[PDB]
Amino acid sequence: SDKIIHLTDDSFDTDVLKADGAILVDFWAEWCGPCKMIAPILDEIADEYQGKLTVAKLNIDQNPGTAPKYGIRGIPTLLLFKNGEVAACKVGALSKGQLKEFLDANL
Ligand SMILES: [Cu+2]
Numbered sequence: 001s002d003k004i005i006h007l008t009d010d011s012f013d014t015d016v017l018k019a020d021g022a023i024l025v026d027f028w029a030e031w032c033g034p035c036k037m038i039a040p041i042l043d044e045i046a047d048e049y050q051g052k053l054t055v056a057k058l059n060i061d062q063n064p065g066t067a068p069k070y071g072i073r074g075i076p077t078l079l080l081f082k083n084g085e086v087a088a089c090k091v092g093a094l095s096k097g098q099l100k101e102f103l104d105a106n107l
Helices: 033-048 096-106
Strands: 004-006 022-028 054-059 077-082 085-091
Touching: 004 033, 022 033, 033 054, 033 096, 077 096, 085 096
Parallel strands: 004 054, 022 054
Antiparallel strands: 022 077, 077 085
């Protein structure tokens, strides 16, 4: 988790993320099994793509305002932002290989 950015509800000013570059945001909660399963994969991605992609997390129990702004209905939900705007999303767990495929399709 050392290379992951900790986001809060204040990180967004509407549906615009107040951060630059390509940023993959994981919406998650501790009670969510599949969320816990992808956490190590997100750590690997943050390491392998350091300097090219920022990986961030928004805990929906601690920050309950943000998910509704994006119509999020389940977790984990990954939203990929480009220059503050949503460019892609993926609901549900996936493998490391699938996450790299998803990123390649978008970046
Ligand atoms: Cu870490």
